[PDB]
């Protein structure tokens, strides 16, 4: 019994169904495998294509999975979509109506033309199961908590008919108990305010990084009129029929007016943060006491894209409610495809779980065998030095407490949003200079965000206050207390409330990743580090071997540990043999405007991304010849010969593209199809 | 007293208040003056900027107003805006959260910074009233009928808080009586029904002239789960949380398939249609049975965007429930834009009123003096023949006569969609084929699509039943059934229901349209002509004398009649010899994406206009670099040289891209101030 999980739209990878659609159209793509009930692999679409949050078709991410199972296409025995036919097809449909030159193609034909057309998979109808939407997001959340039963919460922007559904979970029976209508969505209020502070889809996380930064009581009054709680676990929000938005119209008749791109936080911006942050906790713990008295429950699997709100989470562990409480690694819609899975295992004959609880994320594909990492490593020789130490390990742990910054990449990919020791940038957790320092030279963000302490098993309740109910703290869904006595010592990863959104390894979750925790503690009486993704502003985490290194050249890290191996940049690094491709996406463009006098205007060379939210980026005349000219297998030196060699002007400009990934650039071929090791 | 009225959105000429701001986001810019409560000018911007239905400010028309007042800006004692400032400014604050980039600049700071950067002109904070969306409209509307007491209905896509109001008006009162929420629009349901038939904003006539070929039976009982009438006036439309479109999961869920683009029109869209018009009339005649007997108004004025359907106005008209209805040329938003100058001035003081039913929408600027259209024709003459007849009037209706195909210019053009005989189209309307062949050759437009005719005051009622109230017909706001024994008679101007939407043309509203209409008939024995707007699909209705000449050269046209000049196409145009100059929306594009084997993909090349919903197309290497080297002031045949001279290839892909509006192509200079 083998099943496919699938989420996401059905664009190519170089086009989308309509042009510029939308990326909130059905986004972060991606595929699940599940075999006899267990999950065997689950990688996201952006891992692989390289745009964060894709809405594309996640044809990549399919192909990775049935190799990482071993299986041909035609074994699959069902396919399972996270949404039902007829809403998917509904809002196609009003695609279509909008861009009357679309061919007329819904989903279930656009899921067969991908799978056969990018695999040779020649799907047959039957095997094709539609999954209601918060039933995908209940499955996955519960059948992974290793819970016999549990009170079953789902909140994201919206199903196709709920923002909200409560479901008791016994077994594998799920039993619906309560929904909340889509008007009342708790993403869609947090999306609306986020985008009050010059931020968009997917910077969620940012604007609860920052509300513990202000002061909940300026603004309290203020979303008080946007919502009201009532009896029974009810609650209203109150629209209008200004604009789509449920909280700009008010905030604009107060005076707040909304942040510009490169303003910095005002006080202002820092409050209504907090205040809307302390209404989302207040409505959500209202659901709660409700539903944990009339259920009588002590159990609680949170599911859907707002159990992304550590802080949230937090406050649930901390309110006394529950004894146990599981949140799934990716409880965004990557994981109501895997849901959907189950669910159309279910659907057709018998649903086999999950053994135990899910301790550990690491479910894509792995980095390679060390026969081809190490001849991979060679290719890239003209821009790094590489050494093989005895004990990576061992090597890494002593780095770490001389105070160099790493990048740790091992083993397979995990899934969801956090970096848990597969795909991590890794440094002492203890100097609070290290956020300034990481924070904005090495991989370029914003400073305000601490960032997340990684904590053995066997010291973890030495640091942190893992009290309240029995969480599970092993993929960092929930913000809990810094001792206060620890709270100086550790300075990296403790916020300005005291808190830290902390990860638990054991042997068990992390084999690995624990030896090196533990190996750095006993160097230092602190076995706590800080642990942030392994990506820059323009990604999302790195994947390929390829994509670890690239990522490492184009940031200020000191050392990377991939798989063994020691990786420094060189001396003065040989742009020139490295050979530039085109994305999917990219787009090369020479443009002239309007000009006074109704002449030909400015001519401007550009590159950039096309998908909605794409980047750009000007390009002088001799790039632009030069990047005209890639064929794909030409180096970026022989290439440079046609404008008169790779002066040092040019190859600065090159790097900068590269920076913001423009364009792919890495040694000619690549590292093969990727090993069997067992 | 000199007031300004103004509606619109606020972007400049080359740039949007955000990058690609959607076409309905306040469209259909204008601006109105009006003296004494007289309306002395008024004109739509997309007449000015040559995009249908704009959004962008009105610059240029607050301009063209005050040339043809007489005006100077320190004139103008008020300048009235068609909506309340907090509404525009809260979705002007919506847009700004999607766009963190854009400048905090709301419509008070844009009004005045486009005021005073265009026109040199400091307008004080004091002298800008804003207003209520509907009752712009409404003043427009009723101020306009010539009636002292009316009930004034109006119904749009939305107000600030409604989507339809209804009022008494006695004298210059304006009191509000009902209104009917934003959830409830008509105009909202009929875009939204209009999206399925592969149209878009600015199509729903063309749906509407649709309808006639339909069966309302067909999806009676599908449409019918989308309203509920309901006691005493009321109603309910019944929407969804699928989509933001009201008709479509419904009719998805019953397997009709949205029509594409290029694609014929099936029998389910022209029945499609037929139930979406005859759901609206059931609801406005609903309405206005209830507010016709509850108010107890003999009279009736329509307005709104709603009330620029015809076929709808006609019904109203045949219904027996008002003995008069007054509809407005323009009862759109740019007419509310004229209803917020009469608003403004009751604000700030007295309001003086129209002393007359509005009979001519003749408002906009003229071609210029005699003398500077016959040096600017001559500018043209590499291009045209031109003849002057010693009666133009005479000679263009012998002409029409002969089965000749005329452009008619004349005078001050057409304020609302309507060609009046100012900017028109004309031809014999009895020929069935003059249908078939002006659809298919000249405005290049769907063959279902019909004619309408302009008849004599006096020949009217010989070829029209307009039994039933008295309705004004100056402004083709009317469909009326064609007498069953003139059907025949009149084929090209029929439709393929027995109506035709008409305008009865007097000495009055149009003396010189209504001699070239009676000199026909005395010809002919049928004073009725087929009257079709002068543009050709790229474009809206041509303004100027280069519009003019620039359309007629680049539709199949016979003849041109402007200001009494002949004017016909040579044998040998020479293209050669005009001056190529980019629109401050023109764009051109080199481009490359991704090829195979993730190569830089080959080369193509593009010109296209910089606004939502513009056009583009392909151009080629050689026309690529020579439209680089445009400069406004060298010819083509110059610019040509630099790829090696106007080779055929050439001229002809630039005929095309003429043809298609991507940039202006005139003679060097200009008219002049007019
Ligand atoms: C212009 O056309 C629109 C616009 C909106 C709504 C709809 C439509 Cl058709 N109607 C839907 O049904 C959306 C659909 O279900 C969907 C994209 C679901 C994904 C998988 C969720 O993630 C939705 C969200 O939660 C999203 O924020 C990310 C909120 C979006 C609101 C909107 C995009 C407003
Ligand atoms: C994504 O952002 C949206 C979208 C919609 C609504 C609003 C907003 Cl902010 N909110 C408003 O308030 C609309 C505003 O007042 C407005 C543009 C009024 C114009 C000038 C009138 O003409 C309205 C119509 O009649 C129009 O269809 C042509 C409505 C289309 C529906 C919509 C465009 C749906
Ligand atoms: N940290 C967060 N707090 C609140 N809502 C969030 C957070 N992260 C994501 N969401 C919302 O979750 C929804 C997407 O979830 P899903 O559809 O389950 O992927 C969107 O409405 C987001 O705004
Ligand atoms: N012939 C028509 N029938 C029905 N509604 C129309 C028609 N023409 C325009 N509208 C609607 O009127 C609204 C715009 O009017 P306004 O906002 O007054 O310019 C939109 O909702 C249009 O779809
Ligand atoms: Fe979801
Ligand atoms: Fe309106």
Not at 18 to 28: A, R
Not at 330 to 352: N, Q, R
Not at 415 to 423: E, S, V
């Given at each position: 019994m083998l099943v496919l999980g699938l989420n996401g739209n059905f664009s190519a990878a170089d086009t989308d169904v309509?042009?510029?659609?939308?990326?909130?159209?059905?986004?972060?793509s991606a595929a699940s495998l599940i075999r006899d009930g267990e999950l065997v692999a689950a990688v996201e679409e952006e891992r692989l294509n390289r745009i964060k949050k894709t809405t594309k078709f996640?044809?990549?991410?399919?192909?990775?999975c049935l190799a990482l199972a071993g299986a041909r296409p035609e074994d699959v025995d069902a396919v399972g979509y996270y949404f039902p036919e007829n809403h998917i097809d509904t809002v196609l449909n009003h695609l279509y109506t909008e861009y009357p030159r679309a061919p007329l193609r819904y989903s279930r034909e656009l899921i067969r033309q991908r799978l056969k057309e990018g695999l040779g998979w020649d799907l047959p109808d039957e095997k094709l199961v539609y999954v209601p939407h918060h039933e995908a997001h209940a499955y996955s959340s519960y059948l992974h908590s290793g819970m016999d039963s549990a009170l079953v919460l789902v909140l994201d922007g919206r199903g196709e008919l709920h923002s909200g559904t409560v479901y008791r979970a016994?077994?594998?029976?799920?039993?619906?108990?309560?929904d909340y209508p889509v008007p009342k969505s708790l993403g869609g209020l947090y999306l609306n305010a986020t985008y009050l502070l010059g931020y968009g889809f997917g910077?969620?996380?940012?604007?609860?990084?920052?509300?513990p930064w202000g002061n909940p009581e300026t603004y309290r009054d203020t979303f008080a009129k946007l919502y009201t709680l009532q009896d029974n676990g009810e609650y209203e929000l109150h629209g209008n029929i200004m604009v789509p938005n449920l909280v700009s119209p008010l905030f604009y008749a107060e005076g707040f007016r909304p942040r510009r791109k490169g303003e910095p936080f005002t006080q202002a911006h820092r409050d209504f943060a907090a205040a809307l942050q302390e209404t989302v906790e207040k409505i959500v713990l209202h659901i709660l006491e409700y539903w944990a008295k009339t259920s009588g429950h002590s159990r609680l699997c949170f599911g859907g894209g707002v159990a992304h709100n550590s802080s949230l989470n937090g406050l649930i562990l901390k309110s006394g409610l529950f004894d146990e409480v599981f949140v799934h690694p990716?409880?965004?819609?990557?994981?109501?495809?895997?849901?959907?899975?189950?669910?159309?295992?279910?659907?057709?004959?018998?649903?086999?779980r999950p053994?135990?609880?899910?301790?550990?994320?690491?479910?894509?594909p792995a980095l390679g065998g060390r026969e081809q990492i190490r001849a991979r490593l060679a290719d890239w020789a003209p821009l790094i030095d590489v050494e093989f130490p005895d004990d990576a390990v061992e090597t890494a742990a002593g780095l770490l407490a001389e105070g160099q910054v790493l990048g740790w990449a091992y083993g397979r990919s995990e899934?969801?949003?956090?970096?848990?020791?597969?795909?991590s940038i890794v440094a002492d957790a203890r100097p609070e200079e290290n956020r300034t320092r990481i924070?904005?030279?090495?991989?370029?963000?914003?400073?305000?965000?601490?960032?997340?302490?990684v904590v053995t098993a066997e010291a973890a309740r030495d640091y942190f206050d893992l009290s309240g109910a029995d969480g599970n703290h092993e993929f960092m869904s929930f913000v809990v207390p810094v001792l206060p006595e620890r709270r100086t010592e550790l300075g990296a990863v403790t916020h300005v409330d005291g808190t830290a959104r902390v990860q638990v390894v054991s042997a068990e979750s992390g084999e690995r990743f624990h030896r090196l925790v533990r190996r750095f503690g006993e160097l230092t009486g602190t076995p706590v580090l800080l642990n942030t993704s392994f990506n820059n502003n323009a990604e999302p985490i790195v994947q390929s071997l390829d994509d670890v290194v690239t990522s490492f050249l184009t940031t200020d890290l000191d050392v990377l540990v991939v798989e063994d191996c020691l990786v420094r940049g060189k001396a003065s690094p040989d742009l020139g043999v490295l050979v530039p491709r085109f994305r999917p996406v990219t787009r090369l463009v020479e443009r002239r405007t309007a000009g006074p006098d109704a002449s030909a205007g400015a001519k401007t060379h550009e590159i950039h991304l096309d998908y909605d939210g794409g980047p750009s980026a000007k390009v002088s005349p001799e790039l632009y010849e030069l990047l005209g000219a890639v064929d794909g297998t030409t180096t970026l030196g022989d290439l440079a010969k046609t404008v008169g060699g790779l002066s040092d002007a040019l190859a600065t400009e090159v790097f900068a593209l590269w920076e913001q990934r423009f364009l792919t650039l890495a040694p000619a071929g690549d590292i093969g199809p990727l090993a069997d090791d067992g």
């Open positions: 309509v042009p510029q659609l939308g990326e909130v159209f059905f986004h972060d996640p044809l990549n991410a399919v192909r990775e016994e077994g594998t029976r799920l039993e619906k108990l309560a910077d969620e996380y940012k604007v609860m990084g920052l509300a990716a409880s965004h819609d990557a994981g109501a495809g895997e849901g959907a899975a189950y669910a159309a295992a279910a659907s057709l004959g018998t649903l086999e053994g135990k609880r899910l301790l550990s994320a690491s479910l894509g899934f969801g949003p956090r970096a848990l020791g597969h795909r924070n904005a030279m090495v991989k370029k963000r914003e400073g305000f965000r601490p960032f997340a302490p």
